[PDB]
Design a protein around this ligand. Structure first.
Ligand SMILES: Cc1cc2nc3c(=O)[nH]c(=O)nc-3n(C[C@H](O)[C@H](O)[C@H](O)COP(=O)(O)O)c2cc1C
Ligand SMILES: Cc1cc2nc3c(=O)[nH]c(=O)nc-3n(C[C@H](O)[C@H](O)[C@H](O)COP(=O)(O)O)c2cc1C
Ligand SMILES: Cc1cc2nc3c(=O)[nH]c(=O)nc-3n(C[C@H](O)[C@H](O)[C@H](O)COP(=O)(O)O)c2cc1C
Ligand SMILES: Cc1cc2nc3c(=O)[nH]c(=O)nc-3n(C[C@H](O)[C@H](O)[C@H](O)COP(=O)(O)O)c2cc1C
Ligand SMILES: O=Cc1ccc(O)cc1
Ligand SMILES: O=Cc1ccc(O)cc1
Ligand SMILES: O=Cc1ccc(O)cc1
Ligand SMILES: O=Cc1ccc(O)cc1
Lengths: 337, 337, 337, 337
């Protein structure tokens, strides 16, 4: 059997294959309340019918002002539990496992009113300057990630992923380019990592299941973070009990990034090798052959697929055919697959 | 531009492209009450996100004993209206038009208790002998199609299609192989067609929107119906106001059928030409090139896609690429399509 | 099995499949003597390795002033026999049958010195006015087609095709738009056809093997030839012993042509049905599904492939895969096909 | 521009792209004289028309008894120069560069009469036991590689590759599993490498152009050679002036090899990184995406394609389309590509 379609167990969770639907914002919560809509349901459940091993729900704000846009999904209120409970149940019924990405847009939040970050530094020339979070505010935000995780557990999610990438709040604390704080949350790598450290420990108090952390393995910028920095954070996350690091990159500030098939794979491979940590590979992986190569050559443990799953919801089937293998089809499509 | 992606107007309905999702039973009404389930919602709505011009909902029984299986959808009760109302609303929200196939399995019903047909002739050796419908029972069934159409209109459907194919009730009345009646519903081509004639006229009393009729253009059997017979029926349907004939074939009785890409297209083109009736082509059509060829060579007006839409929900996108053309993507997928 | 990959016998010739490499000028006779070059050898033989059932060599001029360009292949000299003999031998060694298209560009010849045609009417504004052939010149040309056919037979070709399409010499005689003669070669459909009639009869005197004739089934021009005219010609060719009509279209004069997948298939099916003549379909056919549909629906007997064989020399293999079937691979590629 | 289609200069040779047709035996020298045939010409030249940057001709024996089979190509005689001269000229004319793989089958030679190897050990239970080469015979074989290289230069080849892989002669000397010699050519890694060392130095005396060496980076067998051993040989080859190491693997003896897309890439990456030597990656690479990933992530310098070039001679075009880029088409196919 192909490794891509070989099961894997993480904590109490067993995925039927190594294909993961990468979290992707749909900006479709038109009521601006962070709640799910019929579109979200059809969008996610169709990939479950499509046999994706694990579906990670798009960035979901742990605080309303932590949304990227007012059309984002949210999990800052118990009122968000009802909808998510229906989603997890329906995705699970099709045979897929489901996760949610807990997030906070930080200085990249496109909302009216003050937005927050570790330091009052704008993302770019077009962005509003954020307010530096008070130590009190930082600690309250840590509690919001914990509270959000508790809601995700109640909602029935199998995995929880902390969004510590793409220039958002946590990433902003991690990088010296965006974190100029003079308190316990800034300075040394230990201090810059403190925010994430506290989030992981608190989430641990309410969630014992699989815990992923998505990082931007590089800032591709002089004086910014690079893979060496992230290998360091990874070892600390391993000690804290993080099960897998979802390896993305960039977006802290505009930068020149050479994009190509598997351009972020080196990050997943190095963290896996040097930090002895399971990793998720993502970034222009669009066919089963590359997915299989990545896994067989020990470059990552899970293959995150984003845009290809937008073009082909049934990528699992397509990948199976490309690898000349067979996978179970959803019962209702037996006469077509 | 490509004809396949050029709008077409039928009555007061305008389709953005000429791709139609052929009706396909999902056997997922697990409560056996003919109601829709979350699976049906994700199943159909995902193809609307996928830009299918017109989605025809699977065979929905106009009478509980007219279901193929107890897992079929139904529209024999006002209780079915609420669910269908949500479905049409959500499918239309994506930009697709939606239709429903009104059906009655006749002697091919796989249910407990008496099953009905024009004559007491079983489908095959493994099938129960059906009860010959009394003239009044035939009339009650006509009213049930009428009542079902009224519910469909209320639920918000854009198109209504009468299932007069695949060996089910109406087809059974149409063919001399299954209809041996000597009353007003049998004996001559006109009388064998009477049941359908009354159904069309009655549906017209409560529905003046697009009206489709799916037929099995041939029984592929000696003494059975052939394309010449259906060209005759098409002429009569034209006079009655039918807008398009969905051209399928077979299934009245077991027969040896040579299946291949476009094996039913000749039926669609002959009826279109000889009956001056718009037609829908269906059967082993799996790529944009053939779809465009059928439309451009005037063989049909709409291209019905079945199994390829089970393998690839976003066939519209794939076909556009194959035809070296571009179509609008759902807003949420602009970064991937 | 698939019809596309089922053998077919024409006269004493049996093709292993029904895929034909449509004649395509390579403009590679750099010494301007009409002789073959190493490029031509690799070009044609690679498609034989590729399992194409029948390979038709590009337009080969029966007279030097009948070439389209001075870079064309020729067969107006016994000096051309040696090269063609090597080509047929090597192509047949792979299992493919081979044919040659005998041609004469007429008024579309892009050469220095007088060019000829049935009437002194130029192709367009950027073309030289041709010399009206004297009756004797017409007769000499008929003999040149005969002599060319004799050379083709000697060189080992399996099939001979007369190029009576694309606005070249024979086509020019056939259409009233380009033929205004009032002698035995003009004035009525019979007289306009006379040139072709004499060519067929004379070729028959030295060649009794498969004989094809490529025509432009329509001029797409008011007062020009249309499919009705060609069905008439096909009936006459049938009487003369022509085995198959290769159905192309246009090019006599500039015209607006709606091109799409299978845009010339209607010509092939109408002639096949109304003239009871075997036909070759060509024009935007790029995949196995359409090829099979054309054959199974009785629209043509052979599928001519042009540009797709330039993009994919091994189209036979690709088509087999698309049709979920398998064909024998050349022995040398058994480990790859 | 994509790296796969970015030129690279090695010595005095510039390749227009990084795609290389991996050497592949055709067993088509039916006259058993090691000479080329029309099949070989069409086979190789078609990939040149297909735009492959570099075409490596199949294993060509430096001694008749060094052939794998009596149908192999040879270069053990000046009589082989004439044919090769025509091949290199024609491949170069299409715009591709060409190389030849100098080889000696050793104990895997399937010929009548004594076969040779470093030690009298059979390849497997089905094979004949080879005769241990005398020291004199070994040195004569070194001279045969030199003499063959001289013929390749005269024939017009751009690159010469030494076949030191797949269980053949040189590989047999390199591995302790097959080399039990007690003289200067056996024992220590220095002694086991001596045969290849002498071949490289002698070839250098007659050839100053690009020099490749293909190795089996692992024997996948206990007590056999592994990547660590080959990294060692690579450093020595670097010192000797070898320009690139073509990284294959296995075939010294039967072994359990886990085959998958890019399964030999780790070898190319490690040798490149640790030996500071340019490398060629090969082994189930069938699409442009993986080819691009390998190059962009610095895993190899050239992408060798084998079986995919047997299925798709115009893989370069296919890969270009997969990478959404454009490459020049052969002039004759401008209207198809
Ligand atoms: C429309 C869209 C929405 C996205 N939303 C998210 C998100 O909420 N969280 C996240 O971590 N990444 C997000 N991403 C990044 C993707 O998950 C993925 O890592 C990226 O596209 C690289 O992979 P791909 O080449 O497979 O698409 C998004 C990308 C797109 C195109
Ligand atoms: C699982 C399944 C369910 C189907 N259900 C229906 C149905 O409810 N009504 C109908 O008219 N045809 C039904 N069909 C026939 C299809 O609509 C379609 O006409 C047929 O599959 C031929 O087209 P295709 O080759 O595009 O699939 C079904 C076919 C399949 C495979
Ligand atoms: C480069 C090129 C050369 C051609 N040469 C010839 C020729 O010599 N004789 C002929 O009858 N048609 C010729 N044609 C027309 C083709 O044979 C074929 O009928 C046409 O391209 C339509 O088919 P296709 O879509 O499969 O390419 C040529 C077309 C191209 C693009
Ligand atoms: C029919 C055939 C012939 C081959 N001949 C040779 C050869 O002469 N020399 C060599 O080094 N490898 C030879 N190989 C191995 C290939 O060059 C290539 O390295 C191998 O197939 C792995 O790559 P692929 O997956 O791209 O085919 C051959 C393979 C096949 C299938
Ligand atoms: O909407 C795009 C998006 C990209 C990356 C993220 O992390 C979040 C949103
Ligand atoms: O489930 C298959 C099916 C086929 C044709 C129909 O019409 C109804 C159901
Ligand atoms: O080169 C294009 C060409 C087209 C049609 C012909 O018949 C001859 C040449
Ligand atoms: O013919 C297959 C073959 C494989 C590997 C080699 O090295 C030589 C020949």
């Amino acid at each position: 059997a192909r490794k891509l379609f070989t099961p894997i167990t993480i904590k109490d969770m067993t995925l039927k294959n190594r294909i993961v639907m990468s979290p992707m914002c749909m900006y479709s919560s038109h009521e601006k309340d962070g709640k799910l809509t019929p579109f979200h349901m059809a969008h996610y459940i169709s990939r479950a019918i499509g046999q994706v091993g694990l579906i990670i729900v798009e960035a979901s704000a742990v605080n309303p002002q932590g949304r990227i846009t007012d059309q984002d999904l949210g999990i800052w209120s118990d009122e968000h539990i009802e909808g998510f409970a229906k989603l997890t149940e329906q995705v699970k019924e099709q045979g897929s496992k489901i996760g949610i990405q807990l997030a906070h847009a930080g200085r990249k939040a496109e909302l009216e009113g003050d937005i927050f970050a570790p330091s009052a530094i704008a993302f770019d020339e077009q962005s509003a300057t954020p307010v530096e979070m008070s130590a009190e505010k930082v600690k309250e935000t840590v509690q919001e990630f914990k509270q959000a995780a508790a809601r995700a557990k109640e909602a029935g999610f199998d995995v929880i992923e902390i969004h510590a990438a793409h220039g958002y709040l946590i990433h902003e604390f991690l990088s010296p380019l965006s974190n100029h704080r003079t308190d316990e949350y800034g300075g040394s790598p230990e201090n810059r990592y403190r925010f994430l450290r506290e989030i992981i420990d608190e989430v641990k108090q309410v969630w014992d299941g699989p815990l992923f952390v998505r990082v931007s393995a590089s800032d591709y910028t002089d004086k910014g973070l690079d893979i060496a920095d992230h290998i360091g954070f990874a070892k600390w996350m391993k000690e804290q009990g993080v099960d897998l690091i979802d390896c993305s990159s960039g977006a802290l500030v505009h930068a020149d990034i050479n994009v190509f098939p598997g351009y972020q794979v080196s990050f997943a491979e190095k963290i896996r090798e040097q930090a002895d940590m399971a990793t998720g590979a993502v970034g222009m992986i669009t066919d089963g052959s590359m997915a299989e190569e990545i896994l067989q050559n020990g470059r990552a443990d899970l293959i995150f697929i984003g845009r290809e799953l937008l073009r082909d919801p049934f990528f699992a089937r397509t990948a199976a055919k490309q690898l000349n293998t067979e996978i179970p089809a959803p019962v209702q499509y037996e006469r077509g697959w």
